[model samples]
Target: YFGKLESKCSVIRNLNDQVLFIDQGNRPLFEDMTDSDSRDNAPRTIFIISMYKDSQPRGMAVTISVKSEKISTLSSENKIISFKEMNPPDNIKDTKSDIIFFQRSVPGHDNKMQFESSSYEGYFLASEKERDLFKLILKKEDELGDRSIMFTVQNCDG
Candidate 1:
């Protein structure tokens, strides 16, 4: 089964690979189509991974979209990462410029865990081209040490 969606809550991990919090909710993200006629009507997933870090609530929200699979990091205050799309190599490289993010899972929870991430060196996305099976490689560098976490994402209907 997929992760729990009780009271609109979903659990994710922290930098230490602990399931220390739950996402209070999730919503949809969209692009502005009023000014352009070439935009596609694709939907994106937006949610908050509210948690405490360094004794403070370092809540970060992420917007996950499809295409080259754009994942943007936003402040807890709801500010968006606004960058126009370019070519793939440029887009992948510009992910450090706040255009994309890497998401992966830390093995502690039983819910097929995954963590959406922001700027980090060597973070990347991959796939095997057989089913919609996607993987995210997230690198976390903190005072403790440098570590890498991996997670998988698949299609499911709510």
Candidate 2:
């Protein structure tokens, strides 16, 4: 009926309208965006997304949270543009100083296609600068048994 979750995921796109970071309203499980699925029967969605800040060549993990059917996310990893290479698209702006990330959650047989997040009880990857937090929660109809779940990331340094 409703198809998939009527959720939305947006990010600061550069000239090409590519995603730079998870939008302001998004909240992800871990740091990076991951996808998961179940075939016949699987455990209720349970996974974590790890995040980190990339100051130098080596980026460190930022946030660590669990992703489940209740809490999903939008992606912005592709939106990140190289600051040293090309000019950023006028639409995209640099807001997050610290790196942000989200995780993926797969649901079990009983809790398939539920929209409420499990424990949204994750913490921010502590840093010296001030940062913002956001999360995305949804219920899908096309998931494993009939739905899926994932997460997005966003951060701001003050």
Candidate 3:
């Protein structure tokens, strides 16, 4: 249980209308734009645990892992994204898990959140259209490339 609000089952989708999914190998993939309500196109949901125990929604800091039947875990490097199957971790602040991220609220954008790696400052969880692997971006701008850096963490439909 979280300190205030209960942890929610959430979905992460890029601005390109691509939903995040975990491949069989546990790599994060951006599924193409399609009717998400369809059984075949459902994006994989994730279980986000807030690391901050205060009044912050979703803890301000969070550890995200795949909430599928296998419970895949995702962790990051300065420019690399790696994943594996494991149970959700606890006490991420103490553990300082690589999967930890700061939930950044993008100004002028509603229901949008940018996941900045807590372990690696200056790195944001991002990916590009030409690449399927999720990578960390070190650049900040009035606009990120392809705006792929912007993501909406919400229910499947949103």
**Which candidate gets the maximum lDDT versus the true structure?**
3
> Pairing residues by index, what is the TM-score of model 3?
0.69
Residue 58 lDDT in model 3?
A: 40
lDDT of 3 by residue, 55-85 (tens): 3334276666666656665676544677655
Cand. 2 TM to true fold: 0.17
Q: By the lDDT metric, which is better: model 1 or model 2?
A: 1
Off by over 4 Å in 1: 1-83, 90-95, 110-115, 120-152, 155-158
Ranking by lDDT: 3, 1, 2
RMSD of 1: 16.8
Candidate 1 lowest-lDDT run of ten = 1-10
Please give, for residues 8-83, the per-residue lDDT of candidate 2 as tens digits. 1222211222122323223222122222322211222222233332333122222222223343332223232111
Q: All candidates' lDDT scores?
A: 0.28, 0.25, 0.58
The best candidate in terms of TM-score: 3
Q: Where's the lowest-lDDT run of ten residues in candidate 2?
A: 1-10
Score candidate 2 by lDDT.
0.25
